[PDB]
């Protein structure tokens, strides 16, 4: 008799488990941005896939629809506020086109390295 403490999972897992091309491109990200898991890449692709999903569902509506405008601008403005979405391409047909490295780019892992201060993604 307590309100159930809600939870959720932050990662997804690829279906084909041994796709060698996919494994290659994953290590590159882990090696570039200094990750330790494939889950650290799985998480971002999971977050990115839901973001696209809202965008997909919104585009099928009619332009300047109440829900589409309200929730669409929020999604655009949020991605902008953290620095993942470019200032010019700011109308959600590009958030559909967003890729993984854009999210990886904003981690305190990378800004700490990009702005000197570590001279190495792993020193970061």
């Amino acid at each position: 008799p307590r309100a159930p403490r809600t939870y959720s999972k932050t990662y997804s897992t690829p279906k084909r488990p041994y796709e060698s091309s996919r494994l290659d491109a994953e290590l590159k990200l882990a090696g570039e941005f200094g990750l330790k898991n494939k889950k650290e890449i799985y998480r971002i692709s999971f977050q990115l896939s839901k973001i696209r999903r809202a965008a997909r569902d919104l585009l099928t509506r009619d332009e300047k629809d109440p829900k589409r405008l309200f929730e669409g601008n929020a999604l655009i403005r949020r991605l902008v506020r953290v620095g993942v979405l470019s200032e010019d391409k700011k109308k959600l047909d590009y958030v559909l086109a967003l890729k993984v490295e854009d999210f990886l780019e904003r981690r305190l892992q990378t800004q700490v390295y990009k702005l000197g201060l570590a001279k190495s993604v792993h020193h970061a």
């Binding site: 008799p1 307590r2 309100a3 109440p66 309200f70």
Partner: protein, 260 residues
């Protein structure tokens, strides 16, 4: 279930109390009272969650037993006394007067009123009959039964009451074009000057509304509370005057205030 239930669980409490999910297991169960369970606000919720005048519920019991808080004139020592629409919450200390009146989103508001306005209340007559000894009476939405009222006073009218003596001072009838507070439904807390009433003999008269922004909506006649004239209420309305801006409108307002 062999008997009346005497415990209210959280997540089962009415949502318009705005009680957090965790931090406990139960909500205050409103006592038997003038207002229904699911449309009241117990004194503990008001003195602790609304006003922040107490941290624990144990302090609410300490404040109340000292006659500090008074309801509609009388003292009301009950911890979970069910207080509801149109009531008056007075503090002798703090010199503060409140009246329970709804938000625009469907919640009771912290509405501060004058010292003298807090001396009278409104009440919707829910039924009028001929009582024993030939004495006709009216009964208001908060249990009050007033004997010997005006004959023209019919059901669904509203009534201004003395709160100091029990009697009625003035009434308002239920005609087209009268200020209405919507109490119930997803239009709870709107205020819109009656347009038209759908009759429907057998059940659930509809009542069309039109606020001061040329917007229209309908609610069941039971959820309509007449509160005066076009632009001329009979109680001080809360800020925003129940106009229900859109989500896009409210986002603009809250973000139109952006400079420190």
């Amino acid at each position: 279930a062999r008997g009346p239930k005497k415990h209210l669980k959280r997540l089962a409490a009415p949502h318009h109390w705005l009680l957090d999910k965790l931090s406990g297991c139960y909500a205050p169960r409103p006592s038997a009272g003038p207002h229904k369970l699911r449309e009241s606000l117990p004194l503990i919720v008001f003195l602790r969650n609304r006003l922040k005048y107490a941290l624990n519920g144990r302090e609410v019991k300490a404040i109340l037993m000292q006659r500090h808080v008074k309801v509609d004139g009388k003292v009301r020592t009950d911890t979970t006394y069910p207080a509801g629409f149109m009531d008056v919450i007075t503090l002798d200390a703090t010199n503060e007067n409140f009246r329970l009146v709804y938000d625009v989103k469907g919640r009771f508001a912290v509405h501060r009123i004058t010292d003298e306005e807090a001396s009278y209340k409104l009440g919707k007559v829910k039924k009028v009959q001929l009582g024993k000894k030939g004495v006709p009476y009216v009964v208001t939405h908060d249990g009050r039964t007033i004997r010997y009222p005006d004959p023209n006073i019919k059901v669904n009218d509203t009534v201004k009451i003395d709160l100091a003596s029990g009697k009625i001072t003035d009434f308002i009838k239920f005609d087209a074009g009268k200020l209405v507070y919507v109490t119930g439904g997803r239009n709870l807390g709107r205020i819109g000057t009656i347009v038209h009433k759908e009759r429907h003999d057998g059940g659930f008269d509809l009542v069309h509304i039109k606020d001061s922004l040329d917007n229209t909506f309908v609610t069941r006649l039971n959820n309509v509370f007449v509160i005066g004239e076009q632009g001329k209420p009979y109680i001080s309305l809360p800020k925003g005057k129940g106009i229900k801006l859109s989500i896009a409108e409210e986002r603009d307002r809250r973000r139109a205030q952006q400079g420190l």
